[PDB]
Amino acid sequence: TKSDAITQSLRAAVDRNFNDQVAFLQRMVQFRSVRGEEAPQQEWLAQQFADRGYKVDTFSLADVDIASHPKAAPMDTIDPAGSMQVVATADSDGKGRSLILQGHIDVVPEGPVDLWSDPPYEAKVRDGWMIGRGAQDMKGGVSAMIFALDAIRTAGYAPDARVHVQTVTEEESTGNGALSTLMRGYRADACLIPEPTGHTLTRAQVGAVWFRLRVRGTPVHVAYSETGTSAILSAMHLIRAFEEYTKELNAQAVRDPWFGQVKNPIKFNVGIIKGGDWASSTAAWCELDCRLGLLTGDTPQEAMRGIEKCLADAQATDSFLSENPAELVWSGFQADPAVCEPGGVAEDVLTAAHKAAFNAPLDARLSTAVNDTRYYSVDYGIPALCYGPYGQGPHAFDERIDLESLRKTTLSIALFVAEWCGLRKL
Amino acid sequence: TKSDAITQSLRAAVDRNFNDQVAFLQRMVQFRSVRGEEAPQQEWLAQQFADRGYKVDTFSLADVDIASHPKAAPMDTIDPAGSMQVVATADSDGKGRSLILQGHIDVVPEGPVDLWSDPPYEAKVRDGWMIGRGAQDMKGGVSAMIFALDAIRTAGYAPDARVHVQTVTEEESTGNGALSTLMRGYRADACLIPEPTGHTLTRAQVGAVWFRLRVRGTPVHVAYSETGTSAILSAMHLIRAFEEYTKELNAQAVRDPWFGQVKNPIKFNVGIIKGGDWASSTAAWCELDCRLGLLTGDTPQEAMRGIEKCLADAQATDSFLSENPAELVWSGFQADPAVCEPGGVAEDVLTAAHKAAFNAPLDARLSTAVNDTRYYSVDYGIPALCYGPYGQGPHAFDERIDLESLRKTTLSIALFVAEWCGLRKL
Ligand SMILES: [Zn+2]
Ligand SMILES: [Zn+2]
Ligand SMILES: [Zn+2]
Ligand SMILES: [Zn+2]
């Protein structure tokens, strides 16, 4: 009765504030916070936190000397001094369990704007969905965690333990934002990141390596092409080589504890290609930006050695590459895989919070995408939960988030905070 | 003999003026007259022609309504109103045969500047060679044609017939600059273009078609790669299809009366590639700029239909393309092949000039590259000769011209003009 009344009041608070929440998310989605362009979104979030009475700490990857940590990933052409993190702290003298709530506010490129059916940064709301780049992955989740805490406040309460609310860059490229919050000093008894898991807990997740191949060739006139080579055709040779390696890796994936019975869990992608200068000249250069997954039994340095070996073996079978060996650039992720070890108390609390919010059991799922919980649990021994709202089209056209999923997910997170941290009268 | 005397005075004249010729050529090479950026080079040439007493006509592709000609080729992103031609005319009441001397002053992109051993637009001279983009192809030949006429003047003569000296853009991409000189009204009893043929007459030359393939595909999270498709992988499928088609075309090439015994005379090249947005997103787009040659019995229209069919056939067999057909864009050349039929009087005169200058018989060769002689002969019935100096590396790193060759070729052209046009004493 005591317990049901507090729950029914948080539910009330979440509904009361929900119209504001959707507006809040729309504003976020309208920030085109692609890589390198996140500062305005973070400035806004900082002021939003200030408005709610949090102590606010904003700092860059350079402020914590990011490259000094062995798990920091290389930053390619992006200046670490411009890559901004925001951590809001509600301090407390309470006896409950402290919590980190974290989400990323970087979003992946929208792609060809003409292929979206509603514009990617307008945040059009339609038939109970909001369409936008970042709406699902993961600004929706970010709105859910902030408003979970607003709901507790609206209901007349405050968490009975220290809480940090973290908004980070670089999740989609390195993970260095998440890592920097830990380098900066922030700890808690648990961490929850509301990636768009469709109301599931991510039980295990792959890691990943980003790498760029820079290929040369011997340019000649097309008329004399046999006397030269093409860097673009040689790049294609390497793509085929990496595809074969990836098939070999997936044949071995059956030995993995968690992903053993999943079909082709290791994914290889050539995401960006550029090369050549002239339709009637042999291409002298070609660059490929790639990604390769790794499983729970692998480390990134093992996967990097494997990548180097695959490339070394493939250079020998191409004439242009025997005279012009391709350069390998570590261009981003060197990311650990992670497991949410079953049987933890944090998961028990989320199970009960989920039950109350969705009137269903909490399902666990595998993920062939990376997420930032890995830093919290692998590197800092913090129980970490990846769990969030439902939507469609991450990294795709017409990415969209289910607004009723979001309401329920916001409630679930609020209920989680209440049990995990405990409540006190505001 | 009297003809031997005139030849010796022309030999002396070319030698006297050669240091000036080299400085003139260096200045030309120092103009980075890549496509769209040729106007300063043309403004300088116009003035150099005015300084020599020629009547000078400069006009753009727009000024002749280029697109109105059936042999005009598409201009892609390049504004015809800014593509400048220069035609210098030396009128005569003489009874000799009139002559066009023509060269292109557009140069192909230099490619990775760090892979040149001497910078591409510095025109360094070392060990009897000049290194530079355009030095061989074909600013060298332009200097030769200009200084051949300067030698005739130095020796105390003028050509005894009308001469037009033409410098044009667009040879490396469409041929529209050459065609515009003819649409403007310029005619003569013969035309000579000093492409760097290594002191050979080009007997026959391929045509060519430029085309761009614009792919789509369905972008997803690499994590769910199989859910979607890669536009990059689909572009590769098309490249393979065009390579197979080119193979079939070369199988049929045995029936060409000029190229029938050449191995692989038809060349396919993918010169430029761009695609995708993100290492961890499936590529939604990919664009390829290509070139395909065609042989002397083929027409550009027929080649174009063949390219369209090859593409149509290949769309069927790719998943992403089966639902997202790639678009073909005509991107430049729609260039006729050409033949310099043997037995012509112009060739006889060139043969004599060549023997006098080089003490060697004139060899004739086949070319697997297009040149602008096609318009003069095919479209306007003007006997046209492609013949010029020796170098190395057209469209390649460290393009260079042999200065001893340049000097002798300049004499050869002077001797050709003297006999073709006749000479009168100043
Ligand atoms: Zn995410
Ligand atoms: Zn993502
Ligand atoms: Zn040329
Ligand atoms: Zn050329």
From TrEMBL, chains A, B:
Its cofactor is Zn(2+); Co(2+). Gene3D superfamilies: 3.30.70.360, Zn peptidases (3.40.630.10). Its EC number is 3.5.1.16. It comes from the Bacteria. CDD domains: M20_ArgE_DapE-like. Pfam families: M20_dimer (PF07687), Peptidase_M20 (PF01546). GO terms for molecular function: acetylornithine deacetylase activity; metal ion binding. Zn(2+) 1 binds at H104, D137, E171, E172, E195. Residues 204-316 form the Peptidase M20 dimerisation domain. Zn(2+) 2 binds at D137, E172, H395. Keywords: Cobalt, Hydrolase, Metal-binding, Zinc. Belongs to the peptidase M20A family. This is ArgE/DapE family deacylase. It comes from Rhodopseudomonas palustris (strain ATCC BAA-98 / CGA009).
